[PDB]
Structure 1
């Protein structure tokens, strides 16, 4: 089946990236004809078992997998506030993904409302409404 071959390839790419994003806690991502499942301790589990930061890692791992699958490489990546809700766990995971993986990408444009992420970035600007108009401040 052509469909099966595609979902299979995407799953392989997603597995490698997710395993990297979770320090090997999860060995693979399984794509069922389309539902996703993760492997932990040799068993496929539903996504309902993932904690906050792991959900962010999985969603991004899958997007990155699709990117590689379709373009063959990643030059530019634009994350337009893909995960606006950010608690302690989610934030730490995102910062981890930024400094260990995203910094390997030629160019990444990350839009967020979280000031704490600035330390894991190469260049930073802050935008704010001043007297009714957007004002840009170069921070780095």
Structure 2
């Protein structure tokens, strides 16, 4: 039954990761290394270690697996909240996130993305800025 679960989560993650990578990776393989979920990717018919992924591909894989888990556990994705999905000022991950925001996240009913990155504004539908002013958080609805 365990293997049945693993194969299913892998199938769901494979479709999303393939979309996020424009078909570069055909599959995400999910295994349980002594009850500790491990991921591998398939490229040109071979399973490869995650060290072969670029920084943008790593964020795409992590996001694909999370989205796969939402479908697996809840059967759909109505709301997605992400807190600082990329490391501070990581450029490569920024670009991939923007592409994912434009092509996939915009189709989810509601997404709440919390980030330090000003460059993500154009890819969002609504922008709210929160800043510490005179010791208190201040909300500015930008759009």
**Residues 18/86 of structure 1: CA separation in 2 closer, same or farther (3 Å cut):** farther
Q: State the TM-score, normalizing by the size of structure 2.
A: 0.94
Q: How does 1:84-99 map to 2 (within 5 A)?
A: 84-99=87-102
Structure 1's unaligned 5+ residue stretches are none
Mapped contact 1:84–1:112 kept (Cα < 8 A): no
Structure 2's unaligned 5+ residue stretches are none
- Of the structure 1 ranges 54-63 and 86-95, higher mean CA displacement relative to structure 2 is found in 86-95
Provide the rounded CA distance (Å) in 1 between the counterparts of 2:126 and 2:134: 26
Mapped contact 1:18–1:57 kept (Cα < 8 A): yes
Mapped contact 2:129–2:141 kept (Cα < 8 A): yes
Provide the rounded CA distance (Å) in 2 between the counterparts of 1:98 and 1:62: 16
Mapped contact 1:31–1:37 kept (Cα < 8 A): yes
Provide the rounded CA distance (Å) in 2 between the counterparts of 1:17 and 1:29: 9
How many aligned residue pairs are there? 139
Deviation per residue, 1:50-80 (Å, 9 max, x gap) = 1101000000000000000000001111001
- The root-mean-square deviation of aligned C-alpha atoms, in Å, is 0.9
Deviation at 1:81, TM superposition (A): 1.4
Deviation at 1:27, TM superposition (A): 0.3
Deviation per residue, 1:17-57 (Å, 9 max, x gap) = 00000000100000122211100111000001111010000
Query: Where in structure 1 do 4 or more consecutive aligned residues deviate above 2 Å?
Result: 82-88
- Residue 38 of structure 1: SS of its match in structure 2? strand
Deviation at 1:84, TM superposition (A): 2.9
